[model samples]
Target: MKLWIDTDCGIDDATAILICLANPSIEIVGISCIGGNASLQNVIRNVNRTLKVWGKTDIPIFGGCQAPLVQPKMEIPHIHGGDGLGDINDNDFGTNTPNKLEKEHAVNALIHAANTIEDLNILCLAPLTNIAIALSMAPEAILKIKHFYIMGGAENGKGNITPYGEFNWRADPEAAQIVLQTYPQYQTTIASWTLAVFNSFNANDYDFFNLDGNLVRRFIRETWKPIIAFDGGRICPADPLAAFIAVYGDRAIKRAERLHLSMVLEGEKLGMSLAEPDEKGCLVVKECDAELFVKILRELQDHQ
Candidate 1:
């Protein structure tokens, strides 16, 4: 299956990318970078460098969305480190020069890609700026896209970044609201911190370290260690869960609710998303089979 990624190249983003590259069933068509944990430039550099690190430089990455559609940009270097990838502190990782291709705005690229592909799966691992812009520019692309998997929002849990919101949606709440309201037919699945914690990885679960590690396993093992080291030995679980769901659809978890939902991006309820009566949005997953999911991840890593 062909997939397009919109990312901010944080530590979790790096882990998830490695998994996508390792999975033979997936053809990562392209990765579009956005401003989140770091600046837009850093995010693009991280994506390009990551592909180079995996020796997948052939995969084209598009640079998009420098700032939030409405609000001034917000960054969390304290969490993602100064450069987004804490361990990869080296300055000379990815290509420093800009991409050679004529850079199209993220929203346009998204629409062009969606309208052309019959069944596109767009996995957005960053802010909703680009996706929301695409909806505003060409709302029909939302319907054209087969599914939109967003690694943002908490359904029924406390947020780590804020009392009520996750990093991505909070960064561009207006964009998020637009997508939530306009994308009627789009199947949206969220990898909120709430559900993600159920799938967080531990440092001891590094069995694949001894094996001739693939790019995915190696990167995950390498970057994840620091997070565990820094955060009293714990890491955010959203990214890997996002990857797992992207790879193994219904098999990843039993079907959850398919109902309408929206974000409360203002005072008191900021970052909260819940079912909206008669609305067309959906909260796709309620419960994840954690044991089975972990087993599948291990198997994916073990397989040649």
Candidate 2:
């Protein structure tokens, strides 16, 4: 599959990137960095570091919007750590620092890539700023995409940020609203917080990937420890699950519902993604096969 990744490059984002990098079937066309778990600067640095660690320097990286379209910039350094890799300094890995990024803005790069690539798939693991901007700039470009899988929003009234908003959507509700409204419903899929929370991985599950000498597994184990500890010994692989669906399709998603969705852009409910019965929308994942997800991750470790 020809893929493009938009991410904030936190620990889970790194895991998702590793999974795609290890998979022989995936051809990563580019990675666009957005500000969410960390600042835009750190997001780009972390992505470059991750690609370098996996020997994937061939993939280009693009810098995107530094803040939400209408709202002030927000970050969760407390959760992702100051450096966005659980504070695991890149110096520890002796990774090369990437000095260059694509010359074009991420919005332009996205538009051009979408128009140029055949049957491209986009995995959105961060705020919707870049995609939304590209959509607004060139609405016809996105029609070239075969699938769009987003790792954001919340279902069942659950959230990890505001009472009704997930971090990614909350980071840029207006952008989310634009993308949700502009994109074709049939080609879009949302992997919400509710689905990820239901498909959690505990310490024991992570230990299964702690086999020695596997660099990818070791990196995942080390970087995820802080998240597990912070979340009471469990870490929700939200981004990784989205990446999986992007590459492998609906194999692990057990239940999904088609719903017209919209994002609240103002007031207390800002960033809240709501389902509308009469609106044109996309597939919202509600349930997943947890065991199948784990098995896939375990197998992905073997590929490294």
Candidate 3:
């Protein structure tokens, strides 16, 4: 299937990309970068470098929003480090072509691609600015897409950015509202951070260092080490959970409850994601078989 990715390229983003690149089912049409882990410039450079590392130089890399559509940008160089891959500098990559599309201009590219594809799958792994803008430009383009998989929002889990908001949705609530209101045809699924708390990463499950031949394995290892260190050596399974949900269905990777969700765009709860009885809200993943999830992750990592 043809797919488009909107990402900030954090360690989690790196892992997700590696998983998608390894899995043959997906043909990543393009990737749009936004500000999250670091500045847009750094994120774009990292994304281009990542594609080169995977030998995917032909894949188009589009630069997206520096901040939210209507708000000041928030950066997390401390947590994600200055480079967004936890400062892991292993293989370097880039393109001769300079950034071809700005964050706002990339919206048109997303719309054009979505319209051309019969069933386009769009994964918004970063803030919703590029998508929100695309919907505003051509709402029909949003309708043409088959599904929407977003790695944002937290219902029961504690918010990383605030008491209520997660970073992605919180980054641009206005843009998120536009997409939620304008696009009703696309099937929606979320890889919630709250649901991620159910799983954990065991370092011994697979060989990261020992698997020297596999770029995917080595990338996961280097990126995950920094992530584990950032979390005070506590393992977080959110990235794998998101990747699993992206490949397998929610039923296969998680147990979710249908919840009408809402967002607070301002004040202390600015980035918080809330759930109520609203028709526009997406499904919130609440529970999952942690052991099974980890087992599947190991199997996929080792076998793939």
Candidate 4:
């Protein structure tokens, strides 16, 4: 798969990127950073830092929108820490600095990818700001891409961030609405928050990620600290499992129910992703096999 990743690059995003990087079958064409889990600046730094730490430096990283399209950005409470990587000090890891990001803005970078990359597949793990912007700029060009694998929303309007909103959708409801509404025109699959919870791994089984590599060990330990603190000891590979679903689609998917889905733009249900029965619209991943996700990670996990 020639994959392009759009992310906020938090701890879970880092783990998700690692899954793609470790897999020989995947060719990560580029990564575009958006402001969600952290600021755009922090998002770029984290991604560059991850690629550097993992020994894959060639993937181009670009900066995207700093806030949602219609509203001003909010002062979000950090779950992945202020720096978006578990708040580790610079000297501790010798890698807390922001590295060089590509010259093109993320929105333009996305447009370019749509125009050039063959069999291009997008794995979006951030707010829909970047994708929505790209779609607005070049609707025809953006539609040229093959498929989209999105990690956002809640199943049946069940929210994680609000009374009925997921973090990504809540981050930018207008952008989410634009993207979700247009998904029916092309091949797209949604991996929701409820699905991630369904595929959660026991904290005791955390050793599965404890491979024998200095960088991997250090990165995992530092980034996972804040998240594990509040997850009730159950480690949900929220972003990572989404990436895995895209890489090994049929081999690992539990269920992908097609439905008519859309995100609420306003009111008490703002950002809620509601779905009703329909013949075709977008594929919502209803379930996944956690052990199967682990099995798919075997080759990559064995790589050190």
Q: Cα lDDT of model 2 overall?
A: 0.82
Span of 10 residues, lowest total lDDT, candidate 1:
93-102
For residues 101-134, write the lDDT of model 4, one tens digit per residue.
8899999988988998788999999999999989
User: What is the overall TM-score of model 4 with all chains considered together?
Assistant: 0.93
After superposing candidate 4, which stretches have Cα over 4 Å from the reference? 89-92, 96-98, 209-213, 296-299
lDDT of 2 by residue, 213-233 (tens): 655666777777787777778
Query: Per-residue lDDT tens digits of candidate 3, residues 139-228?
Result: 877788888877877876367676677777777888776666676622677777776555554445534322444555565566667667
lDDT-sorted candidate list, best first: 2, 4, 1, 3
lDDT of 3 at 82: 69
lDDT at position 117, candidate 3? 76
TM-score of each: 0.86, 0.94, 0.85, 0.93
Arrange candidates, best TM-score first.
2, 4, 1, 3
Badly placed stretches (over 4 Å) of model 3 are 75-77, 90-104, 202-214, 277-280, 288-304
Give candidate 3's whole-model lDDT. 0.69
- Model 2's TM-score against the true structure: 0.94
lDDT of 3 at 32: 85
Clash list (residue pairs), candidate 3? 64-103, 164-272, 165-271, 165-272, 262-274
Task: Kindly list the per-residue Cα lDDT of model 1 for residues 183-296, writing each as its tens digit.
Answer: 752377766766775555555653432234565456556655566665555555577678778777677766466656677767866656665434345655655666666666
